[PDB]
């Protein structure tokens, strides 16, 4: 079951095989060689079948560097698309597109099960029916932008808005109250970043519960394009095998689609709108659909969508958005004021917010708490005009209530306990509904601002009223 | 033997498709019977595309092509320091050969995730604008993007010239740049004495594309040496926009399927796999560093251009140099607005960390405000106050050329205006103030600026507060 | 007068907001048509560059 | 002869030698069991468009004829079942025992095979059944941005098909499988599967399928139409068809035209909708979907399908703002005589046009569009509807029968209207 | 022949010396077994590929064909039945009756759908304006007898309806031989029109030629030739003719569909490198000569509302009068939505339309443009800072841009309004008064959707 290297065009490599046996499309080809002489340099490389050109020749795209190849080398066929470790082995571990641990904690034993990264989406009969909301125990989220169990949330922004913490906290709250593991997939992860990220999760300790994958930038278009799949696979395990609800983070899913058109060229594909691989929708559709809640488990994905030049019509994001059930929009503003999480209360949206889904109770208060904000937001102009006096009392009530509200959206993050000391919070939607409904009834208007700013259940705000002595 | 050499089918435009060479490694050096070197890129079934590195006219059909069995490596050593060589390492400065023992391959993998340590140790650019607002630590990557004739080079230069007391062994890679300029530049280094720590790798605009293509990587190679030793390197790739272009030519010649804006599909991989090679090695590795300064020349300042965008997303932040600022006589032509350093602040030292925090503010508002003066004939509010020290900070951010500033007496001036100890002085006199406020210190605060050195902190606040008056209270007007 | 002028400046203070606000919307209406024309353009350029290669 | 051998495999496109007898547009078959169409017939090979997974196809695999040109299983057995564009059941309800088959590419009823539209198709969605009517055998384009209620519209229209005799076919193209499901049980709750066919082409699925999916639906539909019965068909995003076809088309290296779409990107949609339309048994309505980016009607694909259809516009803002449906009464329009005679003949009108999703009849409908309201403030207005509705289902239960049976309203209700109000 | 390559609508039939260009190959085959289907198809020789091979363009679905079948050369291009029998009949692309009433006599003259355009000696010069009853057109862009009219408009702009109103306003009262060929247009229209032809009382004097959206490219490729040859009969064999071609765009459009498969180098936008010439060889043919006159009105679809698109663009230099429809004006409610500053006619001359009609003509346009320029200010600063002189221009202009609206008889069933044909003298006059300011008191809305100016006064008082 062996073949030989015909042509090596950069990241594109042709193999080839001697009659009969041809490796199937997407099958992992291993090229291991070794230095026979001093005129060669040891080769460890892997390839993926892409096109059967014919004349018993396949076109593969290297997941690593092709410097050092020479026509004729024997290409071993693995007989299966890129398998990667799946299990309790992955947790607290860091891998690459291949599934090779890139950390220093030793390697994976030949024991451990391995699954192929390519695979069809769950059958129409498998994945679930009732639309059920995945509890984050994070106020702003569960209320103004609810997560749908086994769905996709756009995470926008990410310069000094504490987006890392929000992820970190998320992995934590799931693995605790929902008892389910997280798998982060840095796709085209900038290495400086990939390093901090890991360390940050070593100090926070959210790593014990998550699998780390790095498709780093300096990787070839192949590698970057398939990283998402590796992380995803590792995730699916815990969904179907252990029937959990697992988190799949993909930091910048654009890198993926970008790698997509990037690879598409090499294979000689005629470009599509804006030089995008014509196969874009398809490549995205196959990545998302494999993310959902099965009759057994579920997989919730948080993909940081970094939109192309501020254009929300670009086929790249525009494609992504069709796969979105939610958005968590982080803004540096609310951070500068001392509201963390920095989740924008009027921007960050969600599909779960609907009477049909969350009933009137939630939808009512929630849609209201938004209204009282888009009131306090517009009065910013009139407040610099007629000041805080006699600006219309039906408004001053808004301005008062609204301040406490946008303050009570800030929460205690467990992950934050590292350097703060306050242990952190987990508030169910139930709790978060009351705390707001009550505040919207004004039952708190007699309490200081710096009460509802960084707390848990409404009752905590109240205890925060003992200034002692 | 019979295979390991080949015969030239086609010649032209720096490219040679040869027969034979059935054993050439993709990326192997191949020599032509005429002595001119080259490189194998396309290894196809019936032939091999080579990119001639050097004169391609002395090449015809049938000429023999014999392998080397080496992957494009380059000289490396403690003897290049002070020498001007091409991407091949071949001295062009016309003083002797470069006598070096060791060597390193151009293509090399970057330090592994674990291998590195979050950058903390700064790079003192000696430029108030930069190491206050857009700070750069060792092991970082700061892309300085801007339209031609904005000063991009100037910065890199004065930066290097600022590396004497710091421990930094500097490397200036010139790609596409006029060999004219590169000379007048390598000299102004000669005069300031940058050559004692500074390596110069050039491929001018007369040299063939493949050299341009190779120059950047050939540069990092020589850097990498001092890095894996534990020393600290600073590589200035001057103009990746050109190198990235030179690759397009070369790659198009090999008739590689062209992508968006004609650039090959791996054009992104090109730079990515390059820039990553600069970082901060973990203490486990000797804690070395290689800091990279990628240039991107912009047309019209279109940040939305394909190449300029890639590199923007690749680096840790960038420094965007306004085209107009430069003419209006504001040097450096920095745009504090778009200019950002992501690794920032761990790079700055406490003594800056404080007096820099507010610096962004005052300058921020002024950017969002001073669009209005002529209509400000009614100058109103306290919005006049924001402008106040605002227009003054700009003055302080204006620096000379070929005149770096040490952090010590830098944090003090970035202190003065930010505390009001400047505000009582009109803009007319701001520049020619900080000028003697330095000397006033180099004589009478020479004790004060010390605490600033040895502690990198100012917990200072009290003394300087009064000690600053010691000056304004003797200055002219 | 004082109350007249007080109005004047005010009425102008606003009429100069309505214009600003409106002008700001003229951006949105154009930003959109710029992106669209930013797209069709980068799509035509590429289609041109490939279609000129397949011709070789 | 029949059997061929694979030569080149990749991207849903495979070509092979032999197959000397293959007809153009003949659904061939590969060894791995995957179906495929023969698009291109060259001297030395056969262009074949794989309809399904292409990974299991290598060089040398056997490809056999069928001798059937691009058909798909038709019959009653389809109702209430969820199958792909190949008719092959995905809802895991067991196989579909069908008898008759219908070809995918069929010519549409000739000028002489057609009659002008008279019989209305009641959507039950007030705003539509009033402002923009759809007559059986019409084509009304429902166009709007992402998340404007397009999906819901077609769905409320389906439950509302229980009274009249209408077999609905909801073809989801490029839609999330997950969406399809949640959409398919809402039809179950409300009991629409009894009259409806559901063909799913998920976004995970390959281009060729999505390209076919909208046709496999009309095929299945014409059956009942060609039989005298009345049919209704939903395409959700003809946009991912034009797109899917565009992909495939470019993979084939067919030279691209405007916006990358093939020259024939119009024909693609034209020859599809130009299909739906008493010497023949008087027998299909088409409700196309087109997703626009930032409300741009001036777009290529969108303008195209407009130059075909006999359309409705869903504003982006008018939803999130609180208007469901989000209908844009101005830019919306219906060309084709449909209304009921009862329909034919300002801030409060909006509250009335607002309807709750998943709760659909013209009868008590033409009444509320009559009322006798202006005296009641806005909020309780829409509220008013629910009440004044009940009251009529009891008291005016005899007043309705005049509306239904006669579809006309030639004084009484004028008073009824002072029966439920003065109370 | 023997077909050895089948590509979509493009078939490669192999032929020594037989080598049939522009000829029609029929493939007459019978199902030999149960693995085949009966094929009746006609291919049009396109080009000679060499090696005794020819590339052909089908006139229907090519499904079922196989390599090695037998192709017959009819030894002549597509011939179509022409004559006094064509009146009150519906033909195909090939000239086959699709009206289910009989077939055509063997004696009947069959002309080829490919002819060379009339020489410089043939084509006429003379000028005669033609009244349509449309206020806009007649005033700003008048039509010419025997002249070529384009109707440019994007999707759902009112092209169709405008045509209907023309056939209504003109075709009915002319006394001419009508030829209506819907090309690539709607299928419903065919039945809407065919069965209204019977109502009205001309389905005698009109020739019906169809192909619509459901037919392959090859079809639409020639339906514009087939119908032209029809009118060319009555012109060169006997009278004046009204050639109604619905969407000449579909011709060029279908063109690009085939151009790819021909193995052609794509042009701008991916259109056929011959787009220009292919239209040149089918236009000049639609012209009036010293023998007979042809007054043609063609619907021109605008792809994505882009008048810079090679199809309609290239079409412009083919007309003596144009009516360019705008989507904006359409959403304004201005119907027909006709650009008052874009639409043109060679007729606008004092040396053609008279001075009085001329000066008003420009006077309207002048004040419409002056309003156009003002629009950015209005859109930014409202009308507050405009002069007491520019404001007046804003009122007039508007009311003039509204009076440019019209009631089309082929409307009514929708809106419910009856309709009107406004005489040219009455349009000319109506606008005069408006420009002359007798109406500066009446509100805008009064002038919306009306006929003769008197009606505006009527609908005015009705307002209160
Ligand atoms: N003169 C008019 N008066 C009233 N409504 C019109 C008029 N012209 C067009 N419309 C409306 O505009 C729509 C477009 O009609 P149509 O003529 O079919 O456009 P096109 O043929 O250019 O696609 C129709 O639905 C019709 O209701």
For ligand 1, atom 21, the nearest C-alpha belongs to E160
DSSP state of B258: B
Contact across the interface for B261 and C45, Cβ inside 8 Å: yes
DSSP reduced 3-state for B298: strand
Query: Do C53 and B260 lie within an 8 Å CB cutoff?
Result: no
d(Cα D255, Cα B121) in Å, to the nearest integer?
Answer: 55
Measuring from atom 17 of ligand 1, which residue has the nearest CA? E158
Q: Determine the straight-line distance between the first and last CA of chain B, rounded to whole angstroms.
A: 82
DSSP conformation class of E171: I
By the 8 A CB rule, do B177 and B56 touch?
no
Q: What determination technique applies here?
A: X-ray
Residues of chain D by 3-state class (helix, strand, coil), percent to 5: 30, 20, 50
Structural domains of chain E sorted by starting position, each given as residue range(s) with its CATH number in brackets: 1-77 (2.40.10.170), 79-346 (3.40.50.300), 348-464 (1.10.1140.10)
* Residues of E annotated as catalytic (active site), given as ranges: 159, 185-186
> How do beta strands E344-345 and D71-73 pair?
unpaired
Please confirm whether the linkage preceding E84 is cis (ω < 30° from 0): no
Q: Could you tell me if A143 and A366 are in contact, meaning their C-beta atoms sit under 8 angstroms apart?
A: yes
Query: Please, are residues A118 and A287 in contact by the beta-carbon 8 Å criterion?
Result: no
Q: How far is CA E115 from CA E82, E222, E228, E399, in A?
A: 14, 12, 10, 49
Residues of A in contact with C44 (CB under 8 A): none
DSSP string computed for E369-413: HHHHHHHHHHHHHTTTTS-HHHHHHHHHHHHHHHHT----TTTHH
Whether the CB of D254 is below 8 Å from some CB of chain C: the reply is: no
Start-to-end CA distance of chain C, whole Å, equals 80
Distance in angstroms (rounded) separating the CA atoms of residues A5 and A58:
10
Q: Are A168 and A200 in contact (CB under 8 A)?
A: yes
3-state secondary structure E357-375: HHHHHHHHHHHHHHHHHHH
Give the span between the Cα atoms of A139 and A145, in whole angstroms: 9
DSSP conformation letters of B6-65: EEEEEEETTEEEES--TTPPTT-BEEETTS-B-BEEEE-SS-EEEE-BS-STT--TT-EE
Cβ-in-10-Å burial (0-12, 13-18, 19+) of A345 comes to buried
Q: Residue D165: helix, strand or coil by DSSP?
A: coil
SS (H, E, C) B64-106: EEEECCCCCEEECCCCCCCCEECCCCCECCCCCCCCCCCEEEC
D255/C40 touch (CB, cutoff 8 Å), yes or no: no
E452, two tokens? 């003769």
Buried b (16+ CB within 10 A) or exposed e, E379-416: eebeeeebeeebeebbbbbebbbbbbbbbbbbbeeeee
Least Cα distance to E180 among E242, E121, E234, E236 occurs for E242
Chain C contact present for B260, CB below 8 A: yes
- Residues E322, E346: Cα–Cα separation, whole Å: 9
- Asked if chain B contacts chain A via 3 or more Cβ pairs within 8 Å, the reply is yes
Q: Do chains E and C touch (3 or more CB pairs under 8 A)?
A: yes
Do chains D and E touch, with touching meaning 3 or more CB–CB pairs less than 8 Å apart?
yes
Cβ distance A234 to A85 under 8 Å? yes
In angstroms, what is the span from residue E330 Cα to ligand 1's centroid? Answer: 9
Q: What is the Cα–Cα distance from D12 to D52, expressed in whole angstroms?
A: 8
Please report, for residues D115, D116, D129, D165, E120, the alpha-carbon distance to residue D283 in angstroms, rounded to integers and kept in the order given: 10, 12, 21, 12, 54
Q: Per-residue DSSP letters for D15-72?
A: EEE--TTPPTT-EEEETTS-EEEEEEE-SS-EEEEEES--TT--TT-EEE--S--SEE
What would the DSSP string read from start to end of A88-129?
TTTTTEEE-TTS-B-SSS----TTS-EEES--PPPPTTTB--
State the Cα–Cα distance between residues A292 and D214, nearest whole angstrom.
25
Atom of ligand 1 nearest to the CA of D306: 23
Q: Long-range contacts: A223-226, Cβ < 8 Å, 24+?
A: A223/A63, A223/A64, A223/A96, A223/A97, A224/A97, A224/A187, A224/A188, A224/A255, A224/A256, A224/A259, A224/A262, A225/A256, A225/A259, A225/A260, A225/A262, A225/A263, A226/A48, A226/A63, A226/A82, A226/A97, A226/A117
The reply to whether E263 touches chain C by the CB within 8 Å rule is: no
Contact D182 A131 (CB under 8 A): yes
Partnered with residue E334 across adjacent β-strands are: none
Q: How far apart are the CA of B166 and the centre of ligand 1, in A?
A: 77
The Cα E148–Cα E316 span in angstroms is: 10
Does the CA dihedral B243-B245-B249-B250 come out positive or negative?
A: positive
Coil vs helix vs strand at B319: strand
From the CA of E411, how far away is ligand 1's center (Å)?
A: 8
Q: Please, are residues B129 and B399 in contact by the beta-carbon 8 Å criterion?
A: yes
What residues line ligand 1, using a CB cutoff of 6 Å? Answer: D 307, 333, 335; E 153, 155-161, 335-336, 408, 411, 414-415
Q: Which residues pair with A49 in a beta bridge?
A: A60
User: Kindly report the CA angle at A98 between A93 and A101, in degrees rounded to 5?
Assistant: 25
Q: Is C28 exposed, middle or buried (0-12, 13-18, 19+ CB in 10 A)?
A: exposed
Return the H-helix or E-strand segment holding E192.
helix E187-200
CA E103, CA E127: separation in Å to the nearest integer? Answer: 40
Q: Is the bond into B240 cis (omega within 30 degrees of 0)?
A: no
**Chain mean position to CA B104:** 22
CA angle (D255, D261, D262) in 5-degree steps: 45
Sign of the dihedral through C-alpha B350, B355, B356, B357: positive
Query: Which one of A270, A275, A313 has the shortest CB-CB distance to C42?
Result: A275
Query: From the annotation, which residues of A make up the binding site for ATP?
Result: 157-164
What is the C-alpha separation between D55 and D14, in angstroms, rounded?
11
Dig out the tokens for A25 from the structure: 């499309």
Contact check, Cβ <8 Å, A264/B314: no
Kind and range of the H or E element at E460? Answer: helix E453-461
Q: What part of C 1-56 touches D (C-beta under 8 Å)?
A: 32, 36, 40, 43, 47, 51, 54
Which residue is catalytic, options D335, D382, D383, D404?
A: D335
Angle in degrees, CA E38, E44, E48, rounded to 5: 120
- Is the bond preceding A443 in cis, omega lying within 30 degrees of 0? no
Binding-site residue ranges of A: 157-164
CB B278 within 8 Å of CB B226? no
Show the tokens assigned to B332: 């450096």
Are A351 and D331 in contact by the 8 Å Cβ rule? The answer is no
In chain B, residues with a C-beta closer than 8 Å to the C-beta of C46 are: 259-261
CA atoms within 13 A on the CB side of D269: 32
Secondary structure tally for chain C: helices H, strands E: 1, 0
Q: Does A56 touch chain D (CB under 8 A)?
A: yes
Tokens of B458: 């100012």
Across the interface, whether the CB atoms of D244 and A318 are under 8 A apart is answered no
Tokens at B344, concatenated: 């920032």
Beta strands in D117-183 (DSSP E): 120-121, 134-135, 142-144, 167-175
Judged by CB atoms closer than 8 Å, whether chains meet at B258 and C50 is answered as yes
At residue A153, the 3 state secondary structure works out as: strand
DSSP B131: I
Distance CA D197, CA D222 (A): 12
Distance of CA E335 to the CA centre of its chain: 18
> What domains can you pick out in chain D, each with its CATH number?
1-69 (2.40.30.20), 71-336 (3.40.50.300), 337-423 (no CATH)
**A108-115, long-range: CB within 8 Å, 24+ apart, which pairs?**
A112/A85, A112/A86, A112/A87, A113/A85, A113/A86, A113/A87, A114/A83, A114/A84, A114/A85, A114/A86, A115/A83, A115/A84, A115/A86, A115/A233, A115/A236, A115/A237
- CB neighbours of A273 closer than 8 A, spacing ≥ 6? A315, C39, C43, D259, D260
User: Rounded distance, CA B135 to CA E451, Å?
Assistant: 74
Question: Which DSSP string do the residues of E210-276 spell out, in sequence order?
Answer: EEETTS-HHHHHHHHHHHHHHHHHHHH----EEEEEE-THHHHHHHHHHHHHTTPPP-GGG--TTHH
Strand ranges in D116-230 using DSSP code E only, listed in sequence order: 120-121, 134-135, 142-144, 167-175, 196-202
Question: Which pairing describes strands E2-7 and E69-70: parallel, antiparallel, or unpaired?
Answer: antiparallel
How is residue D218 written in tokens? 């009309």
Contact (CB, 8 A) for A275 and B260:
yes
**D296 → closest Cβ in C36, C47, C51:** C36
Minimum distance, in Å, between the CA of residue D259 and any CA atom of chain C: 7
User: Does any CB of chain C come closer than 8 Å to the CB of residue D316?
Assistant: no
**CA-nearest residue, atom 4 of ligand 1:** E411
Report yes or no: C29 at the E interface, CB cutoff 8 Å: no
CA gyration radius for chain A? 25
């Amino acid at each position: 079951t062996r073949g030989r290297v015909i042509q090596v065009m950069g990241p594109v490599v042709d193999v080839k095989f001697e009659n009969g046996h041809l490796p199937a499309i997407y099958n992992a080809l291993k090229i291991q060689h070794k230095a026979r002489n001093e005129n060669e340099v040891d080769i460890d490389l892997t390839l993926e079948v892409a096109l059967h050109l014919g004349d018993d020749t396949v076109r593969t795209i290297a997941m690593a560097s092709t410097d050092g190849l020479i026509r004729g080398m024997e290409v071993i066929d693995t007989g299966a698309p890129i398998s990667v470790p799946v299990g309790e082995v992955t947790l607290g571990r860091v891998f690459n597109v291949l599934g090779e641990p890139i950390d220093l904690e030793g390697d994976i034993p030949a024991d451990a099960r391995r699954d192929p990264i390519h695979r069809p989406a769950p059958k129409f009969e498998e994945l679930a029916t009732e639309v059920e909301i995945l509890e984050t125990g994070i106020k702003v989220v569960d209320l103004l932008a609810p997560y749908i169990k086994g769905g996709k949330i756009g995470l926008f922004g990410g310069a000094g808005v504490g987006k890392t913490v929000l992820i970190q906290e998320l992995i934590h709250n799931i693995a605790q109250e929902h008892g389910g593991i997280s798998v982060f997939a840095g796709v085209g992860e900038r290495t400086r970043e990939g390093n901090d990220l890991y360390h940050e999760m070593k100090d926070s300790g959210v790593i014990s519960k998550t699998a780390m994958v790095f498709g780093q930038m300096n990787e070839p278009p192949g590698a970057r394009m398939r990283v998402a799949l590796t992380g995803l696979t590792m995730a699916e395990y815990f969904r179907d095998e252990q029937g959990q609800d697992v988190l799949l983070f993909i930091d910048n899913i654009f890198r993926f689609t970008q790698a997509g058109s990037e690879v598409s060229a090499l294979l000689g594909r005629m470009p599509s709108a804006v030089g995008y691989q014509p196969t874009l929708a398809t490549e995205m559709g196959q990545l998302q659909e494999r993310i959902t809640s099965t009759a057994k488990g579920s997989i919730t994905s948080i993909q940081a969508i970094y939109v192309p030049a501020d254009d929300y019509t670009d086929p790249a994001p525009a494609t992504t958005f069709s796969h979105l059930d939610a958005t968590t929009n982080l803004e540096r503003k609310l951070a500068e004021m001392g509201i963390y999480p920095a989740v924008d209360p009027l921007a960050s949206t969600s599909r779960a917010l609907a009477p049909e889904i969350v009933g009137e109770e939630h939808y009512q208060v929630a849609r209201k708490v938004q209204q009282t904000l888009q009131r306090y937001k517009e009065l910013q102009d009139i407040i610099a005009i007629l000041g805080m006096d006699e600006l219309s009392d039906e408004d001053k009530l808004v301005v008062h209530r609204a301040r406490r509200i946008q303050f009570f959206l800030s929460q205690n993050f467990h992950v934050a306990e590292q350097f703060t000391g306050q242990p952190g919070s987990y508030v169910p939607v139930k709790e978060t509904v009351r705390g707001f409904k009550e505040i919207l009834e004004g039952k708190y208007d007699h309490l200081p601002e710096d009460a509802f700013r960084l707390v848990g259940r409404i009752e905590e705000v109240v205890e925060k009223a003992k200034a002692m002595g | 033997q019979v295979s390991d050499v080949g015969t030239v089918i086609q010649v032209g435009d720096g490219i040679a498709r040869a027969h034979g060479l059935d054993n050439v490694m993709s990326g192997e050096l191949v020599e032509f019977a005429n002595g001119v070197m080259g490189m194998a890129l396309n290894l196809e079934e019936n032939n091999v595309g080579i990119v001639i590195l050097g004169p391609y006219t002395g090449i015809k059909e049938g000429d023999e092509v014999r392998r080397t069995g080496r992957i494009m490596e380059v000289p490396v050593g403690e003897a290049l320091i002070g020498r001007v060589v091409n991407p091949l390492g071949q001295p062009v400065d016309g003083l002797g050969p470069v006598e070096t023992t060791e060597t390193r391959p151009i293509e090399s993998p970057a330090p592994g995730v674990m291998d590195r340590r979050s950058v903390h140790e700064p790079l003192q650019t000696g430029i108030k604008a930069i190491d206050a607002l857009v700070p750069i630590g060792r092991g970082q990557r700061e892309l300085i993007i801007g339209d031609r004739q904005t000063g991009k080079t100037s910065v890199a230069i004065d930066t290097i010239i600022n590396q004497k007391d710091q421990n930094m062994i500097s490397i200036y890679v010139a790609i596409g740049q006029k060999e004219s300029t590169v000379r007048t530049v390598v000299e102004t280094l000669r005069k300031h004495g940058a050559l004692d720590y500074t390596i110069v790798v050039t491929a001018s605009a007369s040299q063939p594309a493949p050299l341009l293509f190779l120059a950047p990587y050939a540069g990092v190679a020589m850097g990498e040496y001092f890095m894996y030793k534990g020393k600290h390197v600073l590589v200035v790739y001057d103009d990746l926009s050109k190198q990235a272009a030179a690759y397009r030519e070369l790659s198009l010649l090999l008739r590689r399927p062209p992508g968006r804006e004609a650039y090959p599909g791996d054009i992104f991989y090109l730079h990515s796999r390059l820039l990553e090679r600069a970082a901060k090695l973990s203490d486990a590795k000797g804690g070395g560093s290689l800091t990279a300064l990628p240039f991107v020349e912009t047309q019209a300042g279109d940040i939305s251009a394909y190449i300029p965008t890639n590199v923007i997303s690749i680096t840790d932040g960038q420094i965007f140099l306004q085209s107009d600022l430069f003419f209006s006589g504001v040097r450096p032509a920095i745009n504090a607005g778009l200019s950002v350093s992501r690794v920032g602040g761990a790079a700055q030292i406490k003594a800056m960390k404080k007096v820099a925090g507010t610096l962004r503010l005052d300058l921020a508002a002024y950017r969002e405000l001073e669009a209005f003066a002529q209509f400000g004939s009614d100058l109103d509010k306290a919005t006049q106050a924001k402008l106040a020290r605002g227009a003054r900070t700009v003055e302080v951010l204006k620096q000379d050329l070929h005149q770096p500033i040490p952090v010590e007496k830098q944090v003090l001036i970035i202190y003065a205006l930010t505390r009001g100890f400047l505000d009582d002085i009109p803009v007319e006199d701001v520049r020619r103030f900080e000028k003697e406020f330095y000397l006033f210190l180099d004589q009478n605060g020479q004790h004060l600026l010390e605490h600033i050195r040895t502690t990198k902190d100012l917990p200072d606040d009290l003394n300087k507060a009064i000690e600053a008056f010691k000056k304004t209270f003797v200055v002219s007007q | 007068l004082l109350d007249a002028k007080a109005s004047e400046h005010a009425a102008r203070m606003t009429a100069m907001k309505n214009a600003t606000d409106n002008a700001n919307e003229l951006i949105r209406t154009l930003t959109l048509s710029y992106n669209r024309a930013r797209q069709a353009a980068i799509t035509q350029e590429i289609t041109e560059i490939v279609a000129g290669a397949n011709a070789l």
